[PDB]
Amino acid sequence: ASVGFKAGVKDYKLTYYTPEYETLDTDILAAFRVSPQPGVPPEEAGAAVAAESSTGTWTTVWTDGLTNLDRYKGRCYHIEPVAGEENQYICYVAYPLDLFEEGSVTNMFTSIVGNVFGFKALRALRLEDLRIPVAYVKTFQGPPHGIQVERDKLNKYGRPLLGCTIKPKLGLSAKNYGRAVYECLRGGLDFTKDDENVNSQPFMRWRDRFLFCAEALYKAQAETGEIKGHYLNATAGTCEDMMKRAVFARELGVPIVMHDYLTGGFTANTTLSHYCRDNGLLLHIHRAMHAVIDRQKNHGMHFRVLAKALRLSGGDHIHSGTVVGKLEGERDITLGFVDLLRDDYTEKDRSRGIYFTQSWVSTPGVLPVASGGIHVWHMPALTEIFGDDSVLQFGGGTLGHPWGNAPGAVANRVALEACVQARNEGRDLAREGNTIIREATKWSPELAAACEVWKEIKFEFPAMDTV
Amino acid sequence: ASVGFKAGVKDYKLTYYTPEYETLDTDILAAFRVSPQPGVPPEEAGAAVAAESSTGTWTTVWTDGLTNLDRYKGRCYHIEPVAGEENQYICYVAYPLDLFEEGSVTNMFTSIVGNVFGFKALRALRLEDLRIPVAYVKTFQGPPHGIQVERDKLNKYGRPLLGCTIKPKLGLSAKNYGRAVYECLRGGLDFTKDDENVNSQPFMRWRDRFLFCAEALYKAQAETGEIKGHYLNATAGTCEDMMKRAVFARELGVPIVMHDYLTGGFTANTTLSHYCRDNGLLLHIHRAMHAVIDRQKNHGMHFRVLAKALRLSGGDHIHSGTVVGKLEGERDITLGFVDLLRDDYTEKDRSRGIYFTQSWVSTPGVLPVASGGIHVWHMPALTEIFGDDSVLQFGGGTLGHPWGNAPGAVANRVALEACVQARNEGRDLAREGNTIIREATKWSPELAAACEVWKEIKFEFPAMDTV
Amino acid sequence: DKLNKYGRPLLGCTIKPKLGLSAKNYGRAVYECLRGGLDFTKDDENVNSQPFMRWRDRFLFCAEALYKAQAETGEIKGHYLNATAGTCEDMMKRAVFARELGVPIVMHDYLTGGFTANTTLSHYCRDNGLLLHIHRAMHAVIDRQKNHGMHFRVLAKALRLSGGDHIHSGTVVGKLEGERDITLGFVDLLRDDYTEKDRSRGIYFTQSWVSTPGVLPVASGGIHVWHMPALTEIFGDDSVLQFGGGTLGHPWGNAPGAVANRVALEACVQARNEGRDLAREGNTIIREATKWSPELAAACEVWKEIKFEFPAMDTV
Amino acid sequence: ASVGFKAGVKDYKLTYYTPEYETLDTDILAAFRVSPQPGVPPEEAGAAVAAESSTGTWTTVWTDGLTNLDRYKGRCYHIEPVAGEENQYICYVAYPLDLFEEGSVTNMFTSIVGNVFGFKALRALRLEDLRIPVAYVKTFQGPPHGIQVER
Amino acid sequence: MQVWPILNLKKYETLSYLPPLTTDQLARQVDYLLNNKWVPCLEFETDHGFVYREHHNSPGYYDGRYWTMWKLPMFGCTDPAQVLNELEECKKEYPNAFIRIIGFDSNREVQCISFIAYKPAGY
Amino acid sequence: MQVWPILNLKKYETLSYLPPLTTDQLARQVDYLLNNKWVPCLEFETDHGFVYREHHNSPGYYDGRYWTMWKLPMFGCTDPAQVLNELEECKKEYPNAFIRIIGFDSNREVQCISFIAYKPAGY
Numbered sequence A, B: 001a002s003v004g005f006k007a008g009v010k011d012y013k014l015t016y017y018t019p020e021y022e023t024l025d026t027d028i029l030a031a032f033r034v035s036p037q038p039g040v041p042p043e044e045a046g047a048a049v050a051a052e053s054s055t056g057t058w059t060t061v062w063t064d065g066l067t068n069l070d071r072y073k074g075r076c077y078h079i080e081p082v083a084g085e086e087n088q089y090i091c092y093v094a095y096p097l098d099l100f101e102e103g104s105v106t107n108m109f110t111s112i113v114g115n116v117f118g119f120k121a122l123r124a125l126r127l128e129d130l131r132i133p134v135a136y137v138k139t140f141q142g143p144p145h146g147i148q149v150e151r152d153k154l155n156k157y158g159r160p161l162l163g164c165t166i167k168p169k170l171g172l173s174a175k176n177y178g179r180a181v182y183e184c185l186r187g188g189l190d191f192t193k194d195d196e197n198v199n200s201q202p203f204m205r206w207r208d209r210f211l212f213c214a215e216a217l218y219k220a221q222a223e224t225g226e227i228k229g230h231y232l233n234a235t236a237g238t239c240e241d242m243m244k245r246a247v248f249a250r251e252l253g254v255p256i257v258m259h260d261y262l263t264g265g266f267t268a269n270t271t272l273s274h275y276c277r278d279n280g281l282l283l284h285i286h287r288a289m290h291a292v293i294d295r296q297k298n299h300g301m302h303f304r305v306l307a308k309a310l311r312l313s314g315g316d317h318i319h320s321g322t323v324v325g326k327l328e329g330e331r332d333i334t335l336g337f338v339d340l341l342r343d344d345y346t347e348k349d350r351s352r353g354i355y356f357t358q359s360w361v362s363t364p365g366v367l368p369v370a371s372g373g374i375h376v377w378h379m380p381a382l383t384e385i386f387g388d389d390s391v392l393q394f395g396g397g398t399l400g401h402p403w404g405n406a407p408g409a410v411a412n413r414v415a416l417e418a419c420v421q422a423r424n425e426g427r428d429l430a431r432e433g434n435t436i437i438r439e440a441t442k443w444s445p446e447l448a449a450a451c452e453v454w455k456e457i458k459f460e461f462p463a464m465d466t467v
Numbered sequence C: 001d002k003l004n005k006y007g008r009p010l011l012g013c014t015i016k017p018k019l020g021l022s023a024k025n026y027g028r029a030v031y032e033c034l035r036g037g038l039d040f041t042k043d044d045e046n047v048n049s050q051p052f053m054r055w056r057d058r059f060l061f062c063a064e065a066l067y068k069a070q071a072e073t074g075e076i077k078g079h080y081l082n083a084t085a086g087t088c089e090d091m092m093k094r095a096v097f098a099r100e101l102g103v104p105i106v107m108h109d110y111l112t113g114g115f116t117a118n119t120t121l122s123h124y125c126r127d128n129g130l131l132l133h134i135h136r137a138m139h140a141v142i143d144r145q146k147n148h149g150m151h152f153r154v155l156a157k158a159l160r161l162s163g164g165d166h167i168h169s170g171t172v173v174g175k176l177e178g179e180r181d182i183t184l185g186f187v188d189l190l191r192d193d194y195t196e197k198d199r200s201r202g203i204y205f206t207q208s209w210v211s212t213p214g215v216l217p218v219a220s221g222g223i224h225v226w227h228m229p230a231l232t233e234i235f236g237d238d239s240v241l242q243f244g245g246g247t248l249g250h251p252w253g254n255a256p257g258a259v260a261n262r263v264a265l266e267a268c269v270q271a272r273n274e275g276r277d278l279a280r281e282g283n284t285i286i287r288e289a290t291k292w293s294p295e296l297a298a299a300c301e302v303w304k305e306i307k308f309e310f311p312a313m314d315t316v
Numbered sequence D: 001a002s003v004g005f006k007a008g009v010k011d012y013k014l015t016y017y018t019p020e021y022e023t024l025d026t027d028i029l030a031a032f033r034v035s036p037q038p039g040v041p042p043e044e045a046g047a048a049v050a051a052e053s054s055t056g057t058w059t060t061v062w063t064d065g066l067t068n069l070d071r072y073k074g075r076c077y078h079i080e081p082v083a084g085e086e087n088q089y090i091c092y093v094a095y096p097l098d099l100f101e102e103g104s105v106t107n108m109f110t111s112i113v114g115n116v117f118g119f120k121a122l123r124a125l126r127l128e129d130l131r132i133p134v135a136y137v138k139t140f141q142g143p144p145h146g147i148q149v150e151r
Numbered sequence E, F: 001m002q003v004w005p006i007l008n009l010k011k012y013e014t015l016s017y018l019p020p021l022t023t024d025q026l027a028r029q030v031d032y033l034l035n036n037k038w039v040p041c042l043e044f045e046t047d048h049g050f051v052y053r054e055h056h057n058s059p060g061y062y063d064g065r066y067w068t069m070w071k072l073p074m075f076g077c078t079d080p081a082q083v084l085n086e087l088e089e090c091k092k093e094y095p096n097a098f099i100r101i102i103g104f105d106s107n108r109e110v111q112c113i114s115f116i117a118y119k120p121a122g123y
C-alpha cells in the first residue's frame, strides 16, 4: 500500500540493504570492494552504494510514490568481509534490467560507477566484477567479427598470431612508417600496427600513413604468400574524424583498423564497432588509460569489468597484458579475464578473480593481445599462458633486432612455431621453453642473434593487484 | 652526428632524464606524482615515465636514427621529493608540441596517460597537472558558448544560477518527469535536469521525455516570466544516437542539453560540443565516473586535469563538486580548479594544487556546477565559495521539500537571493550565513519548512585527497 | 521594392569599435541605432568570427535587435550580417543561418574573400532572396597609385559582374581618398545600363550592360551630418550613406545619433526637391533643421569644423 | 577606471602610439613602410594606421567603454625612419591574437590591409612583413602535403 | 541629453522624420514629382498601416507592403491641382485610411517618390 | 502546506523573490555596483515586460530580452546619487515602464548586476 510522504533523511539501509533478496536472472550484479570511513557500518555503506547508483538520493523525495520503487531499486543483497582486511567488505549489488539502456555500455557505467566512488562516507571503492544478464547481453552487437570469423577471413589457424608496434612511438614520417611496416611483415609477422598515440600529427598526417602502409603491407603479402594486415588507427578527436579514417581504410581494402576505446570513449567505440561490422573490417582495440583506473586493489574498476564492457561494445582484439612483460599482469587473474573474453560460459571462480558465473549467449569471443616488453625468450611462456587464440606483439622485440626488421620478425616467427611444434609434440613449454628456443637458434641465425641480444632481460616486480 | 645502432636495452635515464632542459613555451608539461618500486631510483622512474609516454620503448630500436629523437622525445626535466613521503616524488615531464594531434583531448591523454600507470617498476602514479601551451589551446573550440554568452542568451545576471536533478534517479515515466519539471521551474529554479543515468530506458524512452519536458518548461517560463531550461540528456550508446537526441532538442527550440563526457567519451563529447556551437545549444557536462579515476592521492589523475581537458573538448557547465555536500571536495583544491575552469590566466599556486601557470588565450570559461547533498542551510557557504558564476543544484533539496516541488524551489531561490542581497550589502556570508537564512524564514514559509527539515544535516568526513 | 524604400538615399551605420564587442552588446548597439531612423546597421568588415564574439551568437542577437527596431518604428530594417569566412563552407554556413533567420541582407568582402567565393555567394543570394552588401577591403592596396595597379573602376565592374547589391564606393568628402569626377564616373558604371566614353571622368570605353541590374554605391568613412548636403548631391537617391562613428559618436547615444543623420538627410531631400541648391545652401539647410531637431543640433555642435582635405594621389 | 565619454575627434596617437609596448608572443606584428602627407607627423601616421586597422574610427565612440580597449587595440610600438628617404618611415604595429579568426587568411588581411592604404593622410603605404605568432599558425592546416611528403 | 521616445513613434519612410508638411510643402513635393516627369498615383490602406509577417518570413518577404490603388496612376498628368484634388477625393472617401502619394519612373520602373499625404485620427 | 500561487506571479530575475526593496536596500545595491567599479546603466520597457518568441524559436533565441537604454551607461560614475537621480528622471518620463538598473564589467564584458528598480501600476 502507499504510505504518506515523510520528508527528511533516513538510513539508506532502510530501503537498500536487502540480504534476503534472491537475484533475478535478468539482473545486472555488481561485486564492490567497499572500504568504509570509520563509523560507517558495512550495511549502510553497501546500501549507500546501491541507492546512489540506482534510484536514490540523500533525503526522501515524494516522487518515489509515483513509481514502484521496489521494482526499480538497486539493492545490496549480500556482504562478505575481506580476509586480512581492516574495515573492507565485498558488497554485492543487484540492479534490475529496466535500469539500463539497451546496447549502451555508456549507460551501464554511468549508473553503476557514476557517483558512488566519491562518497565522503567511503574511504575507497573498487568494482571487481559485473554479472551481465543474457537478456542484456543480447541488446549488444558484440565483436564485429570474433575469433572464428577472424581466422577464417585471414586463413590463419594453429598458432597464436604475431604483431609488432612500429617504433619510435612518435616522430616517424609516413614513408618511413611504411618502410618499417614492409620489412617487418615480409619477415613473418601477421600484423604491424600504429602505436596507440599515432593518430594524426605534424610529423605524420594519417591519410599519408594509411596510404604508404597499404602499399607496404600489400608488398609484403605478395612476397610471402600470407595475408598481412596493419592496424590503421582510427582514434580521433571527434566521431566525424574517426569515421573518415575508418572510411579511407575501407577504400584501401585493408583488413584491420584500431581504436582506443577508453581515451576515444564507449560512445565512439560502439559507433566504430558497428561500422566495422557493416564494412567487414577487423577492429583491434587498445586499452590506453586502463591502468589509471584498474591498477590499485583498493580503488577503481578491475580490468575484467573494462574487458567485459569492451566485448559488449565491440572489438575483435583487446590488449590483455603479457604477464611476463614490462607492465603488470598476474597470471591467474589474467587467465581468468582471458576466459571471460574468449569463451561463452565462465563459472564463478574466486581464485582467478571471477565473482560471477558469466554467460555470453554466443556473443563472439575477443582475441587477447599480449604486448609490452616481450621478446623471443618469453615465447614459450606466452604460448602456454594464452594458447593459439591470442596475438603476441613484439615492437621493440622486432625493431630492436640487430639485423633489422625482417630478421627481427623471422626470429619471432621461428620462436613461435618452434614452441607450437614442441607443444604439439607433447613437450612441456614451462619446463622445456629455454631448450626449445635454444634448439631453434641452432638452425635460425636470426633467432640466435635475437637470443644473443635479450638473453637476460626479465621484468619481475611485486604486483599491486593480486587476488 | 649519427652514431651506430647498438641493439639491446639500456637505462631510460640515458636519454630521458634531462634536468638541464629549459621548457619551451609550446611544450605540454606534466606533473606526475611518482611512487617507484623499491630499488628503482627517482631518475630512472621519471625517465621511464617520460620515455614510454612519448617516443621510447623497452629496448633500443634502429628507427630512431631515421628521425631527430631529441626534437621529439618527452623528457623528465625536474624531480622534487614529496615532503613526508616515503619514496614518492613529483617528476615533471615536458612533451614537444609536435607530439599531439591538434584539437584532440583523446590523443593528448593516449600519450601522457596511456601506458605509464601500469609499469611494473612503479608502485603507483598520479598525474596532478598539465600545462597546456597556448599554441595547443588554440587548436580547440573550447566551450560552445561560455559564461558570458550563456548569461546573455538567458538574460540572467547577478547571482548563481539554480538547478535541480529530478528524482528518483531511475524509474519515473515521461509524463511524470515533465510534471515534476514544471513544478520545480515555476517555483524559481532556472533549470531542472535529467539525472545522469536517465538516457533511454524501458521505464521512459527519451523522445517521450524530451517532448513532455519541453511542454513543462515552456509552461513554467510563461507563468514566471523568466527563461527556463531543462538539461535534456543526449548521452547515448553510439555517436549516432547521441546526435539524434541533440537534433530533437534543437527541433524543440530548448536552450540546453547535457552529456556525460567521461562515460560517453572525449571523441563523442567533442562531436557534441561542435554541434552545440553550430546550433546554439548550451552544453551542460556531467562527470560520471571521475572519482573512479581522481579520488586517491597516490594513483590516478587529479580532477583538475579532467577539468582542463573538458574545457578544451568543450562544455558550458561542468559538475565541480560542492565542498560541503555528500561527495568529497576540499575547498582550496576546488577553488583552484574552479579558477582553471572560469579564468583566462592562473598562476602556479601549490597551496591550491596548481603546479603550472596556465593561460587560456580567451577560451571561454566554464560554469562550475555544485550538486550533491546540498540544501538551503548550505546556501551561504556555496554563494561564498563559488560566487555568482556557478550553478547550484538541489535535487533531493527540492523534491524532498515537505510541500512539493514548487515550494521546494521557492525555498532555494529565496535562500540564494537572501544570501546575494546580504553579500551585496557587505555581510560576511561565512560568519552570518545562519542568520541570513534564519531572517529569511521569517518572511518565507517555504524556506522555513525546508529549514525545519534539514537543520542538522551535515556531511563532514576526512578527505582522501588533500594538498 | 523588397524594402519598400523610395525617394531618398538609404542610411546605414557600421557598429564600433571595429573589434572587441560581445554579441549581446552588438545587438544592443544595433537596436538603438535602427530605432532612431537608420535603415541598416552592419558588421564592421573585420568582424567575422572571433574569441570576443562568435558569429552565430551575433547573427542571433542582431536578429532580435533589428526585429525589435522594426516593430517599434514601422519601417523595414536590416543589419548586414557578415558571411566573409576562411573557407567557402564556412561562408555558406553563415549565409544559411541568415536565411533561417529571415533577415533581408548579408555582406561579403569580395577582394579578401575572393571572386570565386564571392560568385558562389552572389548565386546563393539570388537563390534565396538575400540582399548582398559588398565591402571592398584591400582595394586601396591595389588602386591607390596612379602609376601602378588597377583602377577601382575595373574592380567595380568586376564586382557588378560577379554580383553584389551594394558596393562601398568612397565618400569623396570623408577620411579616405576619392576624387569627385572619377567617383561620379564609376558610380555611373555601377548603376547605369550605358555609359559613353568620357576621359574627363576616367571612362576610357563606352560600356553597355544589357540590363545587368545596377549596384547601389555605399558612401562610408569619416562622414557626418555636415557632409549630408554634399553626399546627397554627389550620389543622389540611389546610394547608401553610412555613419558609424557619425552615429556611435553622438553625445546622446545611438538612437539620437541616428535621428540626427535621418533628419539631416530628409532636410536635404526636402530642400533639393523644393529646388534649393545643395552645394550653395547645404549649411543653411542643415542649420535650419537644428532649429527643430535637438538631436541634429547636438551632432552639429560636435562635428562643426571637422573636414578631411588632402591632396589626391590618383587624379584624371 | 572608467572615465566619462567625451564626444568628438582627437589624435589617434593619444591611444594608438605606444612606443613603450613590449610585444606579446601571441601578437601578430606588422612592418609598414609609411609615407605621410606633408604636415602629418610619423607618430600620428603610425597611430592612424594602427587604429583604423584594428579597433578605432575617426571620432570617439562611447561603446569602447563596454569593452577593454587596451586589451584589443592594435598599437604602433616603434617607428624607424627610412634611410635616404624623404618623409618615409617603418612603423611597427602589434595586433592582439583575439582580433583574428582562427584559420582565416581572409580575416587577417581584412584587418591589417583592409582600409589603411586609402587614408587621405598618407601618400603611400606598403606592408613589408608580418610576424605570425605560433599560436595563430596552429589554427591553419598549412600545405596539404609539403616538401617531404611530396618527394 | 534626450531619450528618443519609444511609444507611438511609428514612422512612414521618406519625409516622415521632418515636421508635418504644410500645404505649400506638400504642393512643392507634387511639383517635384511632375517636374521630373514621373507619373503620380495615390494608394490608401486602412487595415495594416505597417509592415508585418503573417504569411511568410523568408528573406525579403513582408506583408503590409502593398496598399490599395486609388483609381489608376495619373498617366500624362501635368497639373498638380489634379493630384491634390484626387488626394481630397480619396480623403473624403477614406478618412479612416493612411494615404500616400507615389511617383513612377516607367523607364526605370521604380518609384522615385513616395510620401505619406494623410494619416487617420490618432496618427 | 501552501500551494505556490499561479496567477499574477511574474518575476524579474535577481532579487525579485525577496520582499520589495526599501530605499535603503535599493541604495545598498547601487553602492555594491559602484564599489565593485562597475558602470551603471538604466533600461526601460513598456511594451514587452517579459520574454516571448515572435520572430524565431531556434535554441537560445527569445524576443523581449532587449529593453531600451535610458541615455547612456554612466561611465566614470562614483556617486550613487547620480544613479538614483537618473532613476527618478526615467520614472517621471516613463511611469508606465518597467525600469531596471544594470552594471557592466567591461573587462569581462558581462553585466555583473541587474535588478528591477521600478514597476508600473498593477505589477
Ligand SMILES: O=C(COP(=O)(O)O)[C@H](O)[C@H](O)COP(=O)(O)O
Binding pocket: A165, A167, A195, A196, A286, A287, A288, A319, A320, A321, A322, A327, A369, A370, A371, A372, A373, A374, A393, A394, A395, A396, A397, B057, B058, B115, B118
Ligand atoms: O607500447 C606497446 C608495445 O611496444 P613494445 O613491444 O616495444 O613494448 C603497445 O603499443 C601497447 O602500449 C601495450 O600496452 P597494453 O598491452 O598493456 O595495452
Ligand SMILES: O=C(COP(=O)(O)O)[C@H](O)[C@H](O)COP(=O)(O)O
Binding pocket: A057, A058, A115, A118, B165, B167, B195, B196, B286, B287, B288, B319, B320, B321, B322, B327, B369, B370, B371, B372, B373, B374, B393, B394, B395, B396, B397
Ligand atoms: O545526483 C546528483 C545530485 O542530486 P541530489 O541534489 O539529490 O544530491 C547529480 O545528478 C550528480 O550526480 C552530482 O555529482 P558530481 O556533482 O560530483 O558530478
Ligand SMILES: O=C(COP(=O)(O)O)[C@H](O)[C@H](O)COP(=O)(O)O
Binding pocket: C014, C016, C044, C045, C135, C136, C137, C168, C169, C170, C171, C176, C218, C219, C220, C221, C222, C223, C242, C243, C244, C245, C246, D057, D058, D115, D118
Ligand atoms: O570603417 C568604416 C566606416 O566607419 P566610420 O563611419 O566610423 O568611418 C567602413 O566599415 C568601411 O571600412 C569603409 O571603407 P570603404 O567605403 O572605402 O570601402
